[PDB]
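User: I'm curious whether this sequence folds into something compact or stays loose and floppy. Could you predict its structure so I can see for myself?
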Amino acid sequence: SMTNFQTWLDSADIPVQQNGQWIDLETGIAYDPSYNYAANTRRASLSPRGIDARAVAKTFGGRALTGTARQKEWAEKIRAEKVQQMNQDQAEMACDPSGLLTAAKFWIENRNDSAQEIAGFVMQQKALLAQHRSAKAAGQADKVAKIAAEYNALTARWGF
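Assistant: Here's the prediction. I'll summarize afterward.
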């Protein structure tokens, strides 16, 4: 009872999933990483993998992590190593000084997870919040309940 995906995997060497496009399902228009939405200009990207541990997180908007000095040293190293494997949008979302990942505890306790998993977690969290705002504005109580259940499950799975 072999599935098609499993057959392909068994045939493959380095099977990975590319990052899917982010789409507003209301308009069908994708998120454009090459476009600055705030300032209405084309957007350049520094690649995080060529930036050292001292500068990478702050280069993408981050501030110091919170916690004890031990925790802070260790987690700054961990976060730098993770963010160096991200693209610019992933890095900006993970490094958000008002985001979910500002404590040293998160980076210490999730230090073996892939950078892709961490970045996808935080980006899906914020996207769910956007969906929740939109559903709550349009009534749609069932959508609100579904989104809230998914959000709580996702954040609880990551230890929040």
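Summary: The chain has one domain: 18-157. The longest strand covers residues 23-24.
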